Write an enzyme that holds these catalytic residues in place. Structure first.
Site, mmCIF file in Angstrom:
data_model
loop_
_atom_site.group_PDB
_atom_site.id
_atom_site.type_symbol
_atom_site.label_atom_id
_atom_site.label_comp_id
_atom_site.label_asym_id
_atom_site.label_seq_id
_atom_site.Cartn_x
_atom_site.Cartn_y
_atom_site.Cartn_z
ATOM 1 N N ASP A 28 49.127 61.521 -12.038
ATOM 2 C CA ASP A 28 49.734 60.581 -11.082
ATOM 3 C C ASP A 28 48.976 60.581 -9.767
ATOM 4 O O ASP A 28 49.577 60.635 -8.684
ATOM 5 C CB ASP A 28 51.229 60.886 -10.845
ATOM 6 N N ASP A 56 52.006 66.067 -5.191
ATOM 7 C CA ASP A 56 52.673 65.288 -6.266
ATOM 8 C C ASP A 56 54.166 65.289 -5.986
ATOM 9 O O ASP A 56 54.797 66.361 -6.051
ATOM 10 C CB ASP A 56 52.366 65.886 -7.679
ATOM 11 N N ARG A 88 50.029 57.592 -2.557
ATOM 12 C CA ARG A 88 51.343 58.100 -2.143
ATOM 13 C C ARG A 88 51.512 59.599 -2.413
ATOM 14 O O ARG A 88 52.418 60.225 -1.841
ATOM 15 C CB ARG A 88 52.468 57.281 -2.817
ATOM 16 N N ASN A 89 50.719 60.144 -3.345
ATOM 17 C CA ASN A 89 50.724 61.569 -3.645
ATOM 18 C C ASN A 89 49.630 62.373 -2.929
ATOM 19 O O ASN A 89 49.378 63.540 -3.276
ATOM 20 C CB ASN A 89 50.617 61.810 -5.145
HETATM 21 C C1 LIG Z 1 56.835 68.417 -11.551
HETATM 22 C C2 LIG Z 1 55.572 69.018 -10.893
HETATM 23 C C3 LIG Z 1 55.059 68.664 -9.716
HETATM 24 N N1 LIG Z 1 53.941 69.405 -9.537
HETATM 25 C C4 LIG Z 1 53.134 69.392 -8.458
HETATM 26 C C5 LIG Z 1 53.746 69.298 -7.198
HETATM 27 C C6 LIG Z 1 52.964 69.274 -6.060
HETATM 28 C C7 LIG Z 1 53.574 69.198 -4.654
HETATM 29 O O1 LIG Z 1 52.914 68.645 -3.784
HETATM 30 N N2 LIG Z 1 54.804 69.749 -4.476
HETATM 31 C C8 LIG Z 1 55.415 69.906 -3.262
HETATM 32 C C9 LIG Z 1 56.540 70.736 -3.288
HETATM 33 C C10 LIG Z 1 57.214 71.063 -2.111
HETATM 34 C C11 LIG Z 1 56.792 70.565 -0.889
HETATM 35 C C12 LIG Z 1 57.583 71.016 0.364
HETATM 36 C C13 LIG Z 1 55.636 69.766 -0.815
HETATM 37 N N3 LIG Z 1 55.230 69.344 0.435
HETATM 38 C C14 LIG Z 1 55.746 68.226 0.994
HETATM 39 O O2 LIG Z 1 56.593 67.495 0.480
HETATM 40 C C15 LIG Z 1 55.232 67.903 2.389
HETATM 41 C C16 LIG Z 1 55.604 66.849 3.127
HETATM 42 C C17 LIG Z 1 54.950 66.888 4.298
HETATM 43 N N4 LIG Z 1 54.194 67.991 4.328
HETATM 44 O O3 LIG Z 1 54.367 68.695 3.027
HETATM 45 C C18 LIG Z 1 54.931 69.454 -2.028
HETATM 46 C C19 LIG Z 1 51.551 69.399 -6.162
HETATM 47 C C20 LIG Z 1 50.941 69.498 -7.434
HETATM 48 C C21 LIG Z 1 49.416 69.550 -7.582
HETATM 49 F F1 LIG Z 1 48.940 68.467 -8.113
HETATM 50 F F2 LIG Z 1 48.851 69.673 -6.417
HETATM 51 F F3 LIG Z 1 48.993 70.381 -8.438
HETATM 52 C C22 LIG Z 1 51.737 69.497 -8.587
HETATM 53 C C23 LIG Z 1 53.790 70.206 -10.605
HETATM 54 N N5 LIG Z 1 54.797 69.953 -11.456
#
Ligand SMILES: Cc1cn(-c2cc(C(=O)Nc3ccc(C)c(NC(=O)c4ccno4)c3)cc(C(F)(F)F)c2)cn1
Length: 268
Positions: A138, A156, A142-143
């Site tokens: 994805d 993500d 936006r991600n």
């Molecule tokens: C269902 C799932 C999602 N992911 C996943 C989430 C995420 C992710 O970004 N998760 C996430 C979880 C918690 C938070 C708090 C954040 N950060 C923010 O939302 C954020 C907003 C502003 N600054 O940080 C981000 C990233 C990745 C990646 F690609 F980088 F490998 C994978 C893995 N399995």
């Protein structure tokens, strides 16, 4: 989860405010006091009150994935809170939010070199994810999150036809090369300052048009090098698409500012 995620003590977390108006999920900004006593800004995602066991497992599985990737262009997991509730995932704070919404606020306001720097950061993060055998599935503006210094980092937020390669649409053939297709779409989104890819075309028309060889047109004032890079990412044959390492190399050459050659769907 603890294999790849540190258990944070809730007494070290302070919560400031709700951020993103739901776009990131149930997310707040706040502070985390590290073991060294240094305090840093963080984003905090909470698991909803009254969650089911599957919801918890899915939430903690997400943290488990993120915790595997320690890279300047991938969102950094600071840790999780599981021994008290609400259960939390804590990451570094990205002040400028999602890249598509950020660029829409700043139409035609960045230099080409600034935009290339953004694009290079995204490609470097993807080079590491792919090196680690992770297929994102994805990859979309936006991600991508962008911080106060304009550094972009692969994230993500969950749910994507517009960003998906033709083979992944046709028969779920997801590979790092289908992520490279997605990267070409992000490249178009960035150069278009957060325009929606294929605008509001019917999904069935996005699928048919791309299969017939049509591609998104060059963004206004888009350098030829960058439009060609989009076309290369959008090769019908996944084997002909560049690898992420090659994309990074291409962008690093453009960062030296060689680029002044400038270029509904185009049959390409
Ligand atoms: C269902 C799932 C999602 N992911 C996943 C989430 C995420 C992710 O970004 N998760 C996430 C979880 C918690 C938070 C708090 C954040 N950060 C923010 O939302 C954020 C907003 C502003 N600054 O940080 C981000 C990233 C990745 C990646 F690609 F980088 F490998 C994978 C893995 N399995």
């Amino acid at each position: 989860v603890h294999e790849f995620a540190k258990e944070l003590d809730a007494t070290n977390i302070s919560i400031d405010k709700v951020v993103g108006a739901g776009e990131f999920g149930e997310v707040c900004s706040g502070r985390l006091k590290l073991p060294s006593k240094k305090e840093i800004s963080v984003a905090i995602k909470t698991l909803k009150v009254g969650y089911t066991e599957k919801q918890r497992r899915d939430f903690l599985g997400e943290a488990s994935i993120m915790g595997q990737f320690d890279h300047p262009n991938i969102i950094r997991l600071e840790g999780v809170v599981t021994k008290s509730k609400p259960v939390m995932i804590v990451t570094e704070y990205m002040e400028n939010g999602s890249l598509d919404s950020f660029l829409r606020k700043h139409d035609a306001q960045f230099t080409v070199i600034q935009l290339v720097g953004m694009l290079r950061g995204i490609a470097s993060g993807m080079k590491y994810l792919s090196d680690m055998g992770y297929v994102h599935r994805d990859l979309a503006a936006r991600n991508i999150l962008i911080n106060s210094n304009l550094v972009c980092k692969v994230s993500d937020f969950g749910l994507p036809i517009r960003w998906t390669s033709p083979e992944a649409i046709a028969y779920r053939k997801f590979t790092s090369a289908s992520d490279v297709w997605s990267y070409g779409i992000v490249l178009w989104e960035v150069m278009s300052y957060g325009e929606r890819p294929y605008w509001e075309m019917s999904n069935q028309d996005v699928i048919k048009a791309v299969d017939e060889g049509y591609r998104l047109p060059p963004p206004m004032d888009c350098p030829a090098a960058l439009y060609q890079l989009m076309l290369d990412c959008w090769q019908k044959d996944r084997n002909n698409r560049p690898k992420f390492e090659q994309i990074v190399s291409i962008l690093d050459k453009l960062i030296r500012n060689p680029l002044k050659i400038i270029t509904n769907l185009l049959l390409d």
